[PDB]
Amino acid sequence: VDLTPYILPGVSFLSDIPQETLSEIRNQTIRGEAQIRLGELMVSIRPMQVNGYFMGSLNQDGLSNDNIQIGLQYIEHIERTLNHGSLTSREVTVLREIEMLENMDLLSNYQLEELLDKIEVCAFNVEHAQLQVPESLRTCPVTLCEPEDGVFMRNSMNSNVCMLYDKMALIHLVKTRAAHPLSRESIAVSMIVGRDNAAFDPDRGNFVLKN
Amino acid sequence: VDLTPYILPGVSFLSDIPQETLSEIRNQTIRGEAQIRLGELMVSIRPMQVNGYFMGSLNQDGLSNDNIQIGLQYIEHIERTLNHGSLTSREVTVLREIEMLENMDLLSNYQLEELLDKIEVCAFNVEHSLRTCPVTLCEPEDGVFMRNSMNSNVCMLYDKMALIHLVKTRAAHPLSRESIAVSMIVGRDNAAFDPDRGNFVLKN
Ligand SMILES: [Ca+2]
Ligand SMILES: [Ca+2]
Ligand SMILES: [Ca+2]
Ligand SMILES: [Ca+2]
Ligand SMILES: [Ca+2]
Ligand SMILES: [Cl-]
Ligand SMILES: [Cl-]
Ligand SMILES: [Cl-]
């Protein structure tokens, strides 16, 4: 497809293109990619990850700054003319990035320092703690090893049962905003507990919170 | 539980409260709600939908502007003092509203306009049991045919305004609970009453 016909001098937009021509651009992209000619410059339109939006690239090599910028402007125009809401692909990406934020992704920033501080406070030297329990409760569910510095974490928001994790692993889970490996809930301060707040219960076969 | 002791004159903040008192506030909210006394004014602290954040309301009726604003300032302070990041509940709600956006929530504005346009095209009327709309429970003046689901073949007559209301509020299909989509909307000539089935069926 060529759009040189619709070019205009001294400005960064093209003339009123007829819809059927744009539909053919959308078809050529929907196949794979659409190669548009402007002046005698190549631009490649590919369909974006979101349905109905299109993204342009400039197949260029060693061209003049003027040509680069003008080309980019024409891509912006083509993108706006093709896309829903007259958006550029960049704007589309920003909006989609906003959409793709998840529960607690923004509110974790405020809770983080408190949470890390609580981990830091609650962490203990495992071998000094002289835990009389079976090997399985000595090993972290993330590292699959006995940690040197260990931290007790509850199985869920309201669980009376906690497990021993590697401090570094807990720090990694919190810093990556990862879900609790069992409950899949967001990890929160109240889940973290100090060595003296939990005891091994032989009949339940688990560390239980103190009464 | 009272914070008047920690009040300060001519300003919107309280004195350095001792943590054990705040813990008791957190307990009283964690139960249900905590009733705080400030001056001789009631404020109710509830835990927000997000864990770790707290929201204050002023149980008031016909009180002085001064009292309203001062009360609200004290709620702002209490909220900031209690909440993570020193945020107000409002700010929390804004952040959470940002988080709660879903795929296509910003980018789908054209599907509303397309849907409304299709309703507009498909609606039929006078104006230059199967008669009554399942939403309005009335016979509409301007009616529109909508399919019971994505692949139903059976449609019902709705009030145009009701369909506009469903689409504008992004509401689920009242029967199938699917998202309402253009293909579900059909024009008068695409459906016929079938006596044996007792329903409007799509054309063959
Ligand atoms: Ca989101
Ligand atoms: Ca050690
Ligand atoms: Ca060791
Ligand atoms: Ca050692
Ligand atoms: Ca997460
Ligand atoms: Cl849009
Ligand atoms: Cl220790
Ligand atoms: Cl998950």
Short mmCIF file of C-alpha atoms and ligand atoms in Angstrom, two decimals:
data_model
loop_
_atom_site.label_atom_id
_atom_site.label_comp_id
_atom_site.label_asym_id
_atom_site.label_seq_id
_atom_site.Cartn_x
_atom_site.Cartn_y
_atom_site.Cartn_z
CA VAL A 1 0.00 0.00 0.00
CA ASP A 2 1.24 3.53 -0.88
CA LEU A 3 0.12 6.72 0.91
CA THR A 4 2.37 9.24 -0.92
CA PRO A 5 -0.83 10.37 -2.76
CA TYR A 6 -2.15 11.62 0.63
CA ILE A 7 1.11 13.38 1.68
CA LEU A 8 1.06 17.13 2.49
CA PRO A 9 3.90 19.68 2.58
CA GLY A 10 5.18 21.54 5.64
CA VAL A 11 3.11 19.55 8.17
CA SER A 12 3.19 16.21 10.06
CA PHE A 13 -0.24 14.87 8.89
CA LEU A 14 -1.65 13.33 5.70
CA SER A 15 -4.93 14.15 3.91
CA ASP A 16 -8.32 12.49 4.54
CA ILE A 17 -7.66 8.81 3.62
CA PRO A 18 -10.72 6.74 2.47
CA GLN A 19 -11.79 4.02 4.95
CA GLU A 20 -11.61 1.12 2.43
CA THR A 21 -7.87 1.89 2.00
CA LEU A 22 -7.38 1.76 5.81
CA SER A 23 -9.36 -1.53 5.98
CA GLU A 24 -6.90 -2.99 3.44
CA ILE A 25 -4.03 -1.82 5.71
CA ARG A 26 -5.79 -3.59 8.63
CA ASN A 27 -6.13 -6.75 6.45
CA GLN A 28 -2.43 -6.69 5.41
CA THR A 29 -1.46 -6.44 9.12
CA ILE A 30 -4.06 -9.05 10.20
CA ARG A 31 -2.30 -11.42 7.72
CA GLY A 32 1.20 -10.72 9.11
CA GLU A 33 2.49 -7.18 8.61
CA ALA A 34 1.50 -4.35 6.25
CA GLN A 35 4.27 -2.57 4.28
CA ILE A 36 3.25 1.06 3.72
CA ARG A 37 5.05 3.37 1.24
CA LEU A 38 5.32 7.08 2.12
CA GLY A 39 7.31 9.30 -0.21
CA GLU A 40 9.82 6.63 -1.11
CA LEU A 41 10.23 5.48 2.52
CA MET A 42 9.24 2.08 3.97
CA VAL A 43 7.10 1.75 7.13
CA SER A 44 5.94 -1.57 8.60
CA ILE A 45 2.62 -1.78 10.45
CA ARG A 46 2.20 -4.79 12.77
CA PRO A 47 -0.90 -5.59 14.85
CA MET A 48 -0.43 -4.94 18.57
CA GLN A 49 -0.95 -7.51 21.30
CA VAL A 50 -4.33 -5.86 21.99
CA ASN A 51 -7.07 -6.44 19.43
CA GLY A 52 -7.81 -3.52 17.08
CA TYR A 53 -4.58 -1.57 17.61
CA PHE A 54 -1.64 -1.21 15.27
CA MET A 55 2.01 -0.34 15.73
CA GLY A 56 4.39 1.12 13.18
CA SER A 57 8.14 0.69 12.72
CA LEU A 58 10.55 2.45 10.35
CA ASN A 59 12.68 -0.01 8.32
CA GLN A 60 15.48 2.55 7.80
CA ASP A 61 19.30 2.60 7.55
CA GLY A 62 21.65 5.61 7.82
CA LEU A 63 19.03 8.19 6.77
CA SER A 64 18.96 11.93 7.57
CA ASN A 65 17.72 13.11 11.01
CA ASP A 66 14.99 15.11 9.23
CA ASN A 67 13.91 11.89 7.45
CA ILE A 68 13.98 9.93 10.74
CA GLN A 69 11.86 12.47 12.67
CA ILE A 70 9.47 13.10 9.71
CA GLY A 71 9.11 9.30 9.32
CA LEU A 72 8.38 8.90 13.03
CA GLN A 73 5.79 11.73 12.83
CA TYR A 74 4.15 9.97 9.86
CA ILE A 75 4.11 6.71 11.87
CA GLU A 76 2.46 8.60 14.73
CA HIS A 77 -0.13 9.92 12.28
CA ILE A 78 -0.75 6.54 10.66
CA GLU A 79 -1.07 4.98 14.11
CA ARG A 80 -3.53 7.63 15.25
CA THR A 81 -5.54 7.32 12.02
CA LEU A 82 -5.71 3.51 12.32
CA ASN A 83 -6.15 3.06 16.11
CA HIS A 84 -9.25 3.26 18.32
CA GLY A 85 -9.39 6.55 20.25
CA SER A 86 -6.83 8.07 17.84
CA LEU A 87 -4.08 6.72 20.12
CA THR A 88 -0.44 6.07 19.29
CA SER A 89 0.93 2.59 20.06
CA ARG A 90 3.04 4.07 22.87
CA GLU A 91 -0.12 5.44 24.55
CA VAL A 92 -1.80 2.08 24.06
CA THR A 93 1.16 0.39 25.78
CA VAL A 94 0.98 2.92 28.67
CA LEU A 95 -2.74 2.31 29.14
CA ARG A 96 -2.30 -1.45 28.99
CA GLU A 97 0.60 -1.22 31.50
CA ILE A 98 -1.75 0.71 33.78
CA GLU A 99 -4.43 -1.99 33.30
CA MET A 100 -1.96 -4.81 34.01
CA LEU A 101 -1.22 -3.54 37.55
CA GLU A 102 -2.44 -6.11 40.09
CA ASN A 103 -4.00 -6.03 43.55
CA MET A 104 -1.55 -4.41 46.02
CA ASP A 105 1.01 -3.48 43.27
CA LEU A 106 0.67 0.24 44.11
CA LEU A 107 -0.19 -0.11 47.81
CA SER A 108 2.81 -2.40 48.56
CA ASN A 109 5.29 0.55 48.25
CA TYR A 110 3.80 2.05 51.41
CA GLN A 111 3.77 -1.24 53.39
CA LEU A 112 7.18 -2.49 52.28
CA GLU A 113 9.56 -0.90 54.83
CA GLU A 114 7.36 -1.92 57.78
CA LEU A 115 7.12 -5.50 56.41
CA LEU A 116 10.88 -5.79 55.80
CA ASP A 117 11.55 -4.33 59.26
CA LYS A 118 9.22 -6.90 60.80
CA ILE A 119 10.97 -9.73 58.93
CA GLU A 120 14.27 -8.34 60.16
CA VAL A 121 12.98 -8.24 63.76
CA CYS A 122 11.38 -11.71 63.65
CA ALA A 123 14.32 -13.55 62.02
CA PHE A 124 16.29 -15.94 64.27
CA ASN A 125 19.46 -18.09 64.18
CA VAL A 126 17.97 -21.54 63.54
CA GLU A 127 20.78 -23.61 65.05
CA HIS A 128 20.84 -21.42 68.20
CA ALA A 129 17.01 -21.82 68.52
CA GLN A 130 17.41 -25.51 69.32
CA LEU A 131 14.16 -26.54 67.70
CA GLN A 132 13.21 -30.11 68.63
CA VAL A 133 11.19 -31.03 65.52
CA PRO A 134 11.33 -33.36 62.55
CA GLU A 135 13.59 -32.62 59.62
CA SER A 136 10.65 -31.66 57.36
CA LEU A 137 9.77 -28.68 59.60
CA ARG A 138 13.43 -27.55 59.64
CA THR A 139 13.40 -27.04 55.82
CA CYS A 140 12.16 -23.92 53.98
CA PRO A 141 9.30 -24.47 51.48
CA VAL A 142 11.02 -22.09 49.02
CA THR A 143 14.75 -23.04 49.28
CA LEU A 144 14.09 -26.71 50.21
CA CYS A 145 16.98 -26.34 52.74
CA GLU A 146 17.41 -25.66 56.42
CA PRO A 147 18.05 -21.90 56.63
CA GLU A 148 20.69 -20.38 58.90
CA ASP A 149 18.52 -17.34 59.54
CA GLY A 150 14.91 -18.42 59.68
CA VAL A 151 11.56 -16.63 59.97
CA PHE A 152 8.14 -17.97 61.04
CA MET A 153 5.25 -17.17 58.67
CA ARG A 154 1.60 -18.08 59.06
CA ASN A 155 -0.01 -20.29 56.40
CA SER A 156 -2.67 -17.63 55.75
CA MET A 157 -4.15 -14.36 57.08
CA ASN A 158 -5.97 -16.15 59.95
CA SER A 159 -4.10 -19.48 60.24
CA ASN A 160 -2.87 -20.65 63.62
CA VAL A 161 -0.14 -22.67 61.82
CA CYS A 162 3.18 -21.26 60.68
CA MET A 163 6.15 -22.51 58.78
CA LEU A 164 9.83 -21.78 58.91
CA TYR A 165 11.16 -19.90 55.86
CA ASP A 166 14.60 -18.70 54.82
CA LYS A 167 14.83 -14.99 55.62
CA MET A 168 16.38 -14.22 52.22
CA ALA A 169 13.52 -16.13 50.54
CA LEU A 170 10.90 -14.18 52.49
CA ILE A 171 12.66 -10.92 51.55
CA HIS A 172 12.59 -12.10 47.90
CA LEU A 173 8.86 -12.97 48.10
CA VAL A 174 7.98 -9.60 49.65
CA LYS A 175 10.22 -7.49 47.36
CA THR A 176 8.78 -9.20 44.25
CA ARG A 177 5.22 -8.77 45.64
CA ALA A 178 4.81 -12.56 45.18
CA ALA A 179 1.85 -14.45 46.53
CA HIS A 180 2.02 -16.56 49.73
CA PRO A 181 3.21 -19.98 48.51
CA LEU A 182 0.29 -21.80 50.23
CA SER A 183 -2.73 -19.48 50.46
CA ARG A 184 -1.76 -17.29 47.44
CA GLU A 185 -2.77 -14.22 49.51
CA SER A 186 -0.64 -11.08 49.59
CA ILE A 187 2.03 -11.39 52.25
CA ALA A 188 1.28 -8.94 55.13
CA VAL A 189 2.95 -7.99 58.48
CA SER A 190 0.42 -9.87 60.63
CA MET A 191 1.52 -13.14 58.91
CA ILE A 192 5.10 -12.66 60.20
CA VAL A 193 5.73 -13.80 63.78
CA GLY A 194 8.63 -14.03 66.24
CA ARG A 195 10.22 -17.29 67.48
CA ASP A 196 8.54 -17.03 70.91
CA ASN A 197 5.03 -16.66 69.44
CA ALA A 198 4.95 -20.20 68.00
CA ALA A 199 5.65 -23.70 69.37
CA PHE A 200 5.90 -27.16 67.79
CA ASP A 201 2.72 -29.12 68.59
CA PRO A 202 3.45 -32.92 68.37
CA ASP A 203 -0.23 -33.94 67.91
CA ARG A 204 -0.83 -31.47 65.03
CA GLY A 205 2.68 -32.01 63.57
CA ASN A 206 3.19 -28.29 63.01
CA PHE A 207 4.32 -25.09 64.60
CA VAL A 208 1.19 -23.55 66.19
CA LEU A 209 0.78 -19.97 67.43
CA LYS A 210 0.79 -19.50 71.24
CA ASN A 211 -2.40 -19.42 73.35
CA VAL B 1 -12.28 5.49 73.78
CA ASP B 2 -11.19 9.16 73.97
CA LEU B 3 -8.41 11.26 72.42
CA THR B 4 -9.50 14.70 73.78
CA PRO B 5 -6.46 14.54 76.17
CA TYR B 6 -4.22 14.68 73.04
CA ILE B 7 -6.14 17.57 71.38
CA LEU B 8 -4.25 20.78 70.46
CA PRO B 9 -5.66 24.29 69.94
CA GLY B 10 -5.76 26.24 66.66
CA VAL B 11 -4.42 23.36 64.52
CA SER B 12 -5.56 20.20 62.71
CA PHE B 13 -3.27 17.58 64.45
CA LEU B 14 -3.06 15.72 67.79
CA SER B 15 -0.19 15.29 70.29
CA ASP B 16 2.12 12.23 70.42
CA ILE B 17 -0.34 9.41 71.33
CA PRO B 18 1.11 6.25 73.04
CA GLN B 19 1.10 3.11 70.86
CA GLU B 20 -0.83 0.94 73.39
CA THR B 21 -3.79 3.36 72.97
CA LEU B 22 -3.57 3.01 69.15
CA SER B 23 -3.40 -0.81 69.46
CA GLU B 24 -6.68 -0.66 71.43
CA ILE B 25 -8.18 1.45 68.58
CA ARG B 26 -6.97 -1.23 66.11
CA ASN B 27 -8.57 -3.95 68.29
CA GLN B 28 -11.92 -2.10 68.53
CA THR B 29 -11.94 -1.76 64.70
CA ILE B 30 -10.73 -5.36 64.16
CA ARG B 31 -13.82 -6.41 66.19
CA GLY B 32 -16.23 -4.31 64.09
CA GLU B 33 -15.81 -0.55 64.39
CA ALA B 34 -14.04 1.70 66.92
CA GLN B 35 -15.90 4.70 68.38
CA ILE B 36 -13.38 7.48 69.10
CA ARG B 37 -14.23 10.58 71.19
CA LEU B 38 -12.59 13.89 70.21
CA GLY B 39 -13.62 16.98 72.13
CA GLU B 40 -17.21 15.90 72.63
CA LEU B 41 -17.57 14.68 69.02
CA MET B 42 -18.09 11.09 67.83
CA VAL B 43 -15.94 9.56 65.05
CA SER B 44 -16.21 5.95 63.83
CA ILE B 45 -13.12 4.13 62.57
CA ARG B 46 -13.74 1.08 60.37
CA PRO B 47 -11.12 -1.16 58.73
CA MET B 48 -11.01 -0.60 54.95
CA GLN B 49 -11.53 -3.34 52.38
CA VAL B 50 -7.74 -3.48 51.97
CA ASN B 51 -5.81 -5.02 54.87
CA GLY B 52 -3.87 -2.57 57.07
CA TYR B 53 -5.83 0.57 56.18
CA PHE B 54 -8.44 2.39 58.21
CA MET B 55 -11.26 4.74 57.33
CA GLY B 56 -13.00 7.29 59.54
CA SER B 57 -16.58 8.58 59.39
CA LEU B 58 -18.23 11.41 61.31
CA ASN B 59 -21.54 10.28 62.90
CA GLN B 60 -23.03 13.81 62.86
CA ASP B 61 -26.38 15.55 62.21
CA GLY B 62 -26.96 19.30 61.64
CA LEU B 63 -23.78 20.43 63.47
CA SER B 64 -21.75 23.63 62.87
CA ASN B 65 -19.61 24.02 59.70
CA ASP B 66 -16.58 24.64 61.93
CA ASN B 67 -17.33 21.36 63.76
CA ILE B 68 -17.80 19.49 60.44
CA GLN B 69 -14.52 20.73 58.91
CA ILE B 70 -12.52 20.37 62.18
CA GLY B 71 -13.97 16.84 62.57
CA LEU B 72 -13.01 15.96 59.00
CA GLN B 73 -9.48 17.33 59.58
CA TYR B 74 -9.18 15.20 62.72
CA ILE B 75 -10.37 12.17 60.69
CA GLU B 76 -7.74 12.99 58.05
CA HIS B 77 -5.11 13.13 60.80
CA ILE B 78 -6.25 9.91 62.45
CA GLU B 79 -6.31 8.20 59.05
CA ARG B 80 -2.83 9.44 58.17
CA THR B 81 -1.47 8.46 61.60
CA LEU B 82 -2.97 4.96 61.37
CA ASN B 83 -2.45 4.14 57.65
CA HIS B 84 0.61 2.81 55.81
CA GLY B 85 2.41 5.57 53.85
CA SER B 86 0.61 8.21 55.96
CA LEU B 87 -2.23 8.05 53.41
CA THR B 88 -5.83 9.16 53.80
CA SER B 89 -8.56 6.60 53.01
CA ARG B 90 -9.45 8.69 49.92
CA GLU B 91 -5.89 8.30 48.55
CA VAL B 92 -6.02 4.60 49.35
CA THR B 93 -9.30 4.31 47.42
CA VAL B 94 -7.77 6.19 44.44
CA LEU B 95 -4.77 3.86 44.38
CA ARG B 96 -7.00 0.78 44.74
CA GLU B 97 -9.34 2.07 41.98
CA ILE B 98 -6.26 2.37 39.76
CA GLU B 99 -5.26 -1.22 40.68
CA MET B 100 -8.79 -2.57 40.10
CA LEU B 101 -8.80 -1.54 36.41
CA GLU B 102 -9.08 -4.62 34.20
CA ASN B 103 -7.90 -5.56 30.72
CA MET B 104 -9.62 -3.30 28.14
CA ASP B 105 -11.30 -1.06 30.82
CA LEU B 106 -9.60 2.07 29.42
CA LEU B 107 -9.09 0.89 25.83
CA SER B 108 -12.70 -0.38 25.13
CA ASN B 109 -14.54 3.02 24.84
CA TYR B 110 -15.28 2.36 21.15
CA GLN B 111 -17.19 -0.87 21.97
CA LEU B 112 -19.71 1.13 24.04
CA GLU B 113 -20.20 3.57 21.11
CA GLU B 114 -20.44 0.69 18.60
CA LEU B 115 -22.95 -1.09 20.93
CA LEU B 116 -25.08 2.05 21.42
CA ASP B 117 -25.00 2.69 17.65
CA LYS B 118 -26.16 -0.87 17.02
CA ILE B 119 -28.95 -0.50 19.61
CA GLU B 120 -29.95 2.75 17.93
CA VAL B 121 -30.06 1.01 14.53
CA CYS B 122 -31.96 -2.06 15.82
CA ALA B 123 -34.59 -0.23 17.93
CA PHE B 124 -38.18 -0.13 16.55
CA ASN B 125 -41.24 1.94 17.52
CA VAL B 126 -44.39 4.02 17.09
CA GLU B 127 -42.46 7.30 17.15
CA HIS B 128 -41.84 8.96 13.73
CA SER B 129 -46.40 -11.37 27.78
CA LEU B 130 -43.78 -11.12 25.02
CA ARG B 131 -44.77 -7.44 24.60
CA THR B 132 -43.40 -6.59 28.10
CA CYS B 133 -39.71 -5.96 28.84
CA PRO B 134 -38.02 -8.29 31.40
CA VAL B 135 -36.18 -5.29 32.94
CA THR B 136 -38.86 -2.53 32.98
CA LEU B 137 -41.82 -4.95 33.38
CA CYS B 138 -43.73 -2.69 30.92
CA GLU B 139 -44.45 -2.64 27.22
CA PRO B 140 -41.82 -0.29 25.78
CA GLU B 141 -42.60 2.37 23.15
CA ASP B 142 -39.21 1.85 21.51
CA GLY B 143 -38.25 -1.83 21.68
CA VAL B 144 -35.07 -3.79 20.85
CA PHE B 145 -34.52 -7.53 20.27
CA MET B 146 -31.69 -9.13 22.28
CA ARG B 147 -30.52 -12.74 22.22
CA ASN B 148 -30.68 -14.74 25.46
CA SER B 149 -26.98 -15.65 25.09
CA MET B 150 -24.02 -15.71 22.65
CA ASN B 151 -25.39 -18.76 20.75
CA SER B 152 -29.08 -18.91 21.80
CA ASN B 153 -31.13 -18.31 18.59
CA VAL B 154 -33.90 -17.02 20.92
CA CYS B 155 -34.33 -13.33 21.66
CA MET B 156 -36.48 -11.14 23.80
CA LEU B 157 -37.94 -7.69 23.47
CA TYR B 158 -36.34 -5.10 25.77
CA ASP B 159 -36.94 -1.43 26.43
CA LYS B 160 -34.35 0.57 24.47
CA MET B 161 -33.62 2.75 27.52
CA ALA B 162 -33.08 -0.44 29.58
CA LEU B 163 -30.66 -1.82 27.00
CA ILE B 164 -28.86 1.57 26.92
CA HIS B 165 -28.71 1.40 30.75
CA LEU B 166 -27.25 -2.14 30.67
CA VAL B 167 -24.63 -1.19 28.09
CA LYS B 168 -23.70 2.19 29.65
CA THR B 169 -23.21 0.53 33.07
CA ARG B 170 -21.20 -2.31 31.42
CA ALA B 171 -23.65 -4.73 33.12
CA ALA B 172 -23.78 -8.48 32.50
CA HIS B 173 -26.57 -10.02 30.37
CA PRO B 174 -29.49 -10.47 32.83
CA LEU B 175 -30.01 -14.15 31.83
CA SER B 176 -26.68 -15.63 30.69
CA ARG B 177 -24.45 -13.20 32.71
CA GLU B 178 -22.19 -12.94 29.62
CA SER B 179 -20.79 -9.62 28.46
CA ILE B 180 -23.27 -7.93 26.14
CA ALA B 181 -21.78 -7.92 22.60
CA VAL B 182 -22.98 -6.53 19.21
CA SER B 183 -23.90 -9.94 17.76
CA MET B 184 -26.50 -10.35 20.57
CA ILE B 185 -28.39 -7.25 19.33
CA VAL B 186 -30.65 -7.87 16.32
CA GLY B 187 -33.06 -5.90 14.12
CA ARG B 188 -36.85 -6.47 13.92
CA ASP B 189 -36.57 -8.30 10.56
CA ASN B 190 -33.97 -10.82 11.83
CA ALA B 191 -36.37 -12.47 14.34
CA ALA B 192 -39.89 -13.94 14.14
CA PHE B 193 -42.42 -15.15 16.71
CA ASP B 194 -42.57 -18.97 16.64
CA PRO B 195 -46.03 -20.13 17.97
CA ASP B 196 -44.87 -23.69 18.83
CA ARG B 197 -41.83 -22.51 20.86
CA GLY B 198 -43.70 -19.47 22.29
CA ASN B 199 -40.74 -17.17 21.65
CA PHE B 200 -39.08 -14.94 19.12
CA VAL B 201 -36.54 -17.05 17.15
CA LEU B 202 -33.84 -15.80 14.76
CA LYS B 203 -34.39 -16.17 11.00
CA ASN B 204 -33.03 -19.18 9.05
CA CA C 1 -5.36 -3.97 37.02
CA CA C 2 23.87 -20.07 62.55
CA CA C 3 23.50 -25.31 59.67
CA CA C 4 26.66 -22.64 61.28
CA CA C 5 1.16 -9.95 43.87
CL CL C 6 -10.62 3.68 22.80
CL CL C 7 18.63 -15.28 67.06
CL CL C 8 -1.29 -17.60 42.37
#
